[PDB]
Amino acid sequence: RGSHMTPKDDEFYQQWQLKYPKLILREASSVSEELHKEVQEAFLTLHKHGCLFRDLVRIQGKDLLTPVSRILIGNPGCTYKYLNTRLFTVPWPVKGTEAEIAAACETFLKLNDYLQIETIQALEELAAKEKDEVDIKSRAAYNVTLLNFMDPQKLKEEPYFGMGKMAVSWHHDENLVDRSAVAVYSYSCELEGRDPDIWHVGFKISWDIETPGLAIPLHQGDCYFMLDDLNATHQHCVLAGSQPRFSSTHRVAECSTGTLDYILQRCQLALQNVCDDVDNDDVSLKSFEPAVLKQGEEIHNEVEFEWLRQFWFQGNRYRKCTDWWCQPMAQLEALWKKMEGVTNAVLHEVKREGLPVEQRNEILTAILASLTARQNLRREWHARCQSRIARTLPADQKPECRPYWEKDDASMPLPFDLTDIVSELRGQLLE
Ligand SMILES: O=C(O)/C=C/C(=O)NNC(=O)c1cnccc1Cc1ccccc1
Ligand code: NI
């Protein structure tokens, strides 16, 4: 059957060195006990001014409410997207918002600083065994942390090695920089194989349940480290104890599409196709080059769904932690309407009377896939935030479908449903 090893077993410490050397442990003793408290501070400071939320994620086509409660803290303007769920940062006091909360954040920045030293240190020693040093620093340049909290007393049975009950099931970490590390700080409050009452992080090789898996006991204060490509070659998971448990997992998030600066400049590029002397509801474009015309209709989709729909779907939760994204999400919504107008503008032009059908159809082909995907995704977002696991959530937890308007709204140039604006266009393209 399936086997697993812990410190209790003799094979454990030699299995660790042969098939998981890129996993690293640092027990509570490698950390000042004053840092220890001013991290155990905010785990609860943040815990009960209630900043941590269970996410309504998507896995394998089905909508789930995750056991673990979470919060993204980190670099300002940064997002981290796992499971088609874009998390936005409660921000750090980084170089260049309530009083206690903002202290919590500054703290995990200090923690972050510390780990990122320790990560580099151990990455050098790791590298000093297999025989640039700016590769090493980037892969430790953590830009976010995802805090996780679970109280076991409120779980699935670990299938392959009988490891017991799982807070988090066997997975790989998403949206990480390639070969970048992760540093976990682990805070626990208070026999054949592993102790059920203490928390473990489990480890397995990918595609492989024949090799026995590792079950690392994590006590109050212990940090572990997934180094380089180990996250890629290895699956991991979390084994639940009997007590509550907090964890700060520090990541190098792949935000090349993930930074406010990013989505903003995307918008700006999309609006270069606009006569922009005045902000009003009669959008006039500067080109109808089918190339330019898809790029903006694509940026329209990107800002809509990867940002607005994502933000508002986990409706109202940050207003608790910070208002940081408020103005920006307003501004992004603003830019988004102008693009609803740009869309309109393109539609009015494709049935304008002296337009040669030859590149009217070039224009259709240019924008069609975009307006389709805007429907597919509009349906899916409509459906997923009024599915009724979704309204079982309480007052300020509701999935808001924003933005949204209906037929009886002439403040919007276009309908929410585009079903046969779309079909209407491909009829042309066949006839
Ligand atoms: O608390 C720990 O020490 C371990 C935490 C942990 O492994 N978290 N995992 C993630 O944050 C994560 C990142 N990218 C994709 C998925 C996940 C976790 C996950 C997997 C399956 C269901 C819910 C959450
Ligand atoms: Ni993980």
Which residues, chain by chain, have CB under 5 Å from ion ligand 2? 173
Going by the annotation, the residues of the binding site for Fe cation are: 171, 173, 236
Q: Which technique was used to obtain these atomic coordinates? A: X-ray
Pairing mode of beta strands 213-218, 4-5: parallel
CB 346 within 8 A of CB 290: no
How many A from CA of 168 to the centre of ligand 1? Answer: 6
DSSP H stretches of helix in 304-325: 310-313
Residue with tokens 């986990």: 314
CATH of 260-393, one of 3.30.70.20, 1.10.10.10, 1.20.58.1470, 2.60.40.740: 1.20.58.1470
Going by the annotation, the residues of the binding site are: 70, 82, 148, 171-174, 224, 236, 245-247, 249, 251
Distance CA 276, CA 83 (A): 38
**Sign of the CA dihedral running 141, 143, 149, 155:** negative
How many A from CA of 213 to the centre of ligand 1? Answer: 18
3-state secondary structure of 228: coil
How many A from CA of 177 to the centre of ligand 2? Answer: 14
The boundaries of every CATH 2.60.120.590 domain in the chain are 4-259
Residue 195 token pair: 């102790």
The boundaries of every CATH 1.20.58.1470 domain in the chain are 260-393
**Sign of the CA dihedral running 68, 71, 72, 74:** negative
Ligand 1, atom 13, lies closest to the CA of 173
Distance CA 35, CA 41 (A): 10
DSSP H stretches of helix in 128-253: 135-138, 230-233
Distance CA 123, CA 129 (A): 10
How would CATH label the architecture of 4-259?
Sandwich (2.60)
Which of 83, 200, 204, 216 maximizes ligand 1 atoms within 8 Å of its Cβ, making it the mutation to test the pocket?
Answer: 83
Which of 82, 169, 252 maximizes ligand 1 atoms within 8 Å of its Cβ, making it the mutation to test the pocket?
Answer: 82
Lining residues, ligand 1, CB within 6 Å: 66, 82, 146, 148, 168-169, 171, 173-174, 184, 186, 201, 236, 238, 247, 249
Ligand 1, atom 19, lies closest to the CA of 168
Residue 55 token pair: 């996410």
> Taking Cα atoms as reference points, which of 205, 120, 137 lies closest to residue 177?
137
Distance CA 222, CA 204 (A): 20
Distance CA 34, CA 37 (A): 5
CB-based contacts of 365-369 (< 8 A; 24+ apart in sequence): 365/290, 365/429, 366/290, 366/291, 366/293, 366/294, 367/290, 367/293, 367/294, 367/297, 368/422, 368/425, 368/426, 368/429, 369/294
Distance CA 1, CA 257 (A): 44
How many A from CA of 199 to the centre of ligand 1? Answer: 15
Distance CA 120, CA 126 (A): 10
Which of 171, 245, 248 maximizes ligand 1 atoms within 8 Å of its Cβ, making it the mutation to test the pocket?
Answer: 171
181 CB-contact burial (10 Å; exposed 0-12 / middle 13-18 / buried 19+): buried
Q: At what angle do helices 290-303 and 357-384 cross, to 10 degrees?
A: 10
Which residues, at least 6 apart from 261, have a Cβ–Cβ distance to it below 8 Å? Answer: 77
How many A from CA of 134 to the centre of ligand 2? Answer: 25
129 CB-contact burial (10 Å; exposed 0-12 / middle 13-18 / buried 19+): exposed
